[PDB]
Amino acid sequence: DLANNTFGGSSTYPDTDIPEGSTVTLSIEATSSSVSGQGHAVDVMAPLDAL
Amino acid sequence: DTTLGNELANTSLEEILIQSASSVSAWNTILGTLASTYPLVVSSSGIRPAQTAWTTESDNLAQSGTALVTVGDYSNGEAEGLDSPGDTLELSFTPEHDIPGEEFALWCRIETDLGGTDPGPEITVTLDIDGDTYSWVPIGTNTALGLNWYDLANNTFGGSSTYPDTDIPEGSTVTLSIEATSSSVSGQGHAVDVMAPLDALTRVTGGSDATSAYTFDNNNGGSGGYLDGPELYPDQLILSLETATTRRNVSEARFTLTANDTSGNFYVELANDGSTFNRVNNATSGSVTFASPDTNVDTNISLNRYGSRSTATPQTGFNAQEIDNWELYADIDAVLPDDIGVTLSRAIIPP
Amino acid sequence: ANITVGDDQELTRSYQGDPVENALRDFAFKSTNEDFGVGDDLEFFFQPRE
Ligand SMILES: [K+]
Ligand SMILES: [K+]
Ligand SMILES: [Mg+2]
Ligand SMILES: [Mg+2]
Ligand SMILES: [Mg+2]
Numbered sequence: 153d154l155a156n157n158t159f160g161g162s163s164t165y166p167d168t169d170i171p172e173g174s175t176v177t178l179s180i181e182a183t184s185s186s187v188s189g190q191g192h193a194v195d196v197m198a199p200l201d202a203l
Numbered sequence: 204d205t206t207l208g209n210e211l212a213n214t215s216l217e218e219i220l221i222q223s224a225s226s227v228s229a230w231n232t233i234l235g236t237l238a239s240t241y242p243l244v245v246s247s248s249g250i251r252p253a254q255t256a257w258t259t260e261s262d263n264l265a266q267s268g269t270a271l272v273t274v275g276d277y278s279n280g281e282a283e284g285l286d287s288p289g290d291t292l293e294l295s296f297t298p299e300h301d302i303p304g305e306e307f308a309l310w311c312r313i314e315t316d317l318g319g320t321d322p323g324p325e326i327t328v329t330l331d332i333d334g335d336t337y338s339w340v341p342i343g344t345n346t347a348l349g350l351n352w353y354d355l356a357n358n359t360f361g362g363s364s365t366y367p368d369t370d371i372p373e374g375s376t377v378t379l380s381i382e383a384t385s386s387s388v389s390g391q392g393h394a395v396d397v398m399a400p401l402d403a404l405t406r407v408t409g410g411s412d413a414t415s416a417y418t419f420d421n422n423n424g425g426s427g428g429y430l431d432g433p434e435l436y437p438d439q440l441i442l443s444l445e446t447a448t449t450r451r452n453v454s455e456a457r458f459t460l461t462a463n464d465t466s467g468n469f470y471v472e473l474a475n476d477g478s479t480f481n482r483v484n485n486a487t488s489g490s491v492t493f494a495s496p497d498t499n500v501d502t503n504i505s506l507n508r509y510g511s512r513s514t515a516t517p518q519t520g521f522n523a524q525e526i527d528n529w530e531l532y533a534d535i536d537a538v539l540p541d542d543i544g545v546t547l548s549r550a551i552i553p554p
Numbered sequence: 555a556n557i558t559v560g561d562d563q564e565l566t567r568s569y570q571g572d573p574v575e576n577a578l579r580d581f582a583f584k585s586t587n588e589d590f591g592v593g594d595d596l597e598f599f600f601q602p603r604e
């Protein structure tokens with residue numbers, strides 16, 4: 153979970169409400185060079201309500 | 204008729220109770236709109252400053268694989284040596300207010316290799332809020348710390364990342380674990396003497412750092428002694444109560460209050476004009492005469508740290524002043540002109 | 555000079571939509587039951603009864 157956990161990161165989600173019918177865009181972007189050539193491999197992405 | 208036949212209750216026409224609190228909902232009403240981030244606790248036992256620092260001694264932390272280090276200038280004469288990979292120290296706390304993310308600080312009193320030149324391991328800190336884990340690396344692989352107070356949240360010492368500035372909600376179970384994540388040059392490791400997760404209180408005290416709000420003394424007298432240290436509670440909260448409103452002039456007022464302590468900077472301040480506050484210091488009862496009769500009464504209350512002790516860290520400010528049964532009585536006309544030769548008397552029995 | 559309030563007190567209600575007569579009567583009720591009205595001078599008065 154990227155929204156609520158963090159791993160050596162700088163900031164997490166400011167827990168702000170998503171209104172019904174709002175158009176969410178989610179962008180995951182690399183902002184540094186990578187030590188590995190393979191990088192972070194994203195296999196499946198799930199933004200979800202934890203319920 | 205000499206007397207009432209079986210009197211139940213009796214109140215004055217000289218004094219009117221203009222404000223009172225004796226329960227959670229009453230206190231919430233008269234404190235006004237306090238933000239969730241404010242370090243005050245409203246309880247069945249009164250209003251009280253919130254625990255703001257969780258200053259924990261070496262011997263009190265949850266141990267795993269860590270070395271028992273004894274030097275006289277460490278608090279309680281002892282510290283925990285993070286000796287080797289995967290050996291850890293854990294601390295639990297529950298904040299009784301919201302800690303804003305920017306304000307969280309992790310003060311450690313920490314020293315490398317009993318003051319030696321040679322590095323301890325790199326240290327990882329994991330913070331757990333109800334299962335949400337935040338991990339950062341404040342100490343690098345190649346660093347030695349002199350015996351001092353260091354913030355492991357907002358500063359790094361050769362490390363790669365800081366605390367991610369997350370807000371901590373009230374009533375969250377907060378677990379903090381410190382882990383040596385690599386090998387040691389120095390066999391005695393980084394010795395941590397006392398751990399202080401604290402709210403820096405920079406919203407309350409306008410200084411840019413926690414040094415402005417807490418003691419951070421660095422000399423226990425070297426005899427296996429205790430340390431003044433970051434006190435558990437905030438220094439002084441000045442609480443502005445909601446205006447006690449009247450239809451008539453208040454000339455003088457009287458207060459009653461129940462407290463656990465009344466020492467130090469404890470005061471109640473009262474005004475008629477909304478600005479000229481008259482102060483009663485270090486008492487649970489008090490009387491104030493206002494310079495001129497005027498309508499509405501404003502109150503300010505000072506709650507403080509208290510206690511001095513020589514058997515544990517911290518030595519100062521390990522207790523907070525709690526107040527409960529607030530009552531404010533004013534000299535107001537309860538017998539009133541009503542018509543030609545008619546008076547009206549308006550006594551009140553409180554709920 | 556035509557105003558004599560027998561029990562002067564602060565108003566805790568916003569009378570901000572009431573007919574003036576109804577407001578004045580509420581004031582008289584709160585005070586010492588005063589007479590009010592317009593004299594033949596075309597001047598308003600508010601003063602003790604009898
Ligand atoms: K609160
Ligand atoms: K009347
Ligand atoms: Mg969240
Ligand atoms: Mg070990
Ligand atoms: Mg920060």
Ligand SMILES: [Mg+2]
Binds near residue numbers: 280
């Ligand atoms: Mg110690």
